[PDB]
Amino acid sequence: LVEEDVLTSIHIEEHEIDARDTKLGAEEITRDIPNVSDEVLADLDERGIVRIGAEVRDGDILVGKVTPKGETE
Amino acid sequence: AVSKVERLMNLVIALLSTRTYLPAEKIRTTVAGYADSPSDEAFSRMFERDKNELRDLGIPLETGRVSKWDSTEGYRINRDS
DNA sequence: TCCGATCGGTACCGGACATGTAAAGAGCAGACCACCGACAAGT
DNA sequence: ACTTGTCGGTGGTCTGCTCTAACGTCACGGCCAACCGATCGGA
Known about the structure:
This is part of a larger assembly, with chains A and B. Chain A is low in regular secondary structure. In chain A, 0% of the residues lie in helices and 5% in strands. Chain A has no helices and two strands. Chain A has a two-stranded antiparallel ribbon. Chain A starts with 27 loop residues before the first strand and ends in a 7-residue tail after the last strand. Helix content of chain B is 47%, strand content 12%. Chain B has three helices and two strands, in the order αααββ. In chain B, strands 1-2 form a two-stranded antiparallel sheet. Chain B starts with a helix and ends with a strand. The relative contact order of chain B is 0.21. Chains A and B meet through loops of A and loops of B. The structure holds a DNA duplex. Chain B: It comes from Mycolicibacterium smegmatis (strain ATCC 700084 / mc(2)155) (Mycobacterium smegmatis).
């Protein structure tokens, strides 16, 4: 059953993220990501989203959104 | 005791390096040289004089609201211009 | 002695989700800020 | 020579208070719609 894919099903999951308008600033979706390494952003395109057909594991970045933090001590 | 040139340099650096509009109170509290004003009116007059002097030199200061959800006006210097 | 009211209670783990109307308008005043004029004393 | 604390003015915006004079005069809306047991207050 495992070898010949007799009892095999396909499950599709949907992930969504929104960059709304905040009081303290404006939210922009881009591949800035100030604190990461260099290998994490290998699969992201120019606009900061993953490419179609690129396998994603647990913990991988799908959409890179950076939001303003404000004045903090 | 801060010289006027140092005060103006601090003010212009703070305006240039800040990406959001800053109200008068934040500039008074943060930027050095504005903490020695005996009264609020004296600080306002000094700030108006300094802003007029900076505007006379051709620096394109922009005035607008701090946020779309707030009414107080702020100051910002466009880096492109 | 009988009986119409009132208050107390009724298993567990897993999960799921966010409101729907306004019968108005005008005159006067107060607080605060971006733009400004003078004027003498300290720098 | 340059600069600043002190003084006074305009106009805009946000916020609050007071006023308006034909005649007008005591609300629907109703869930509840279980089931058993114990207790206090009227008849």
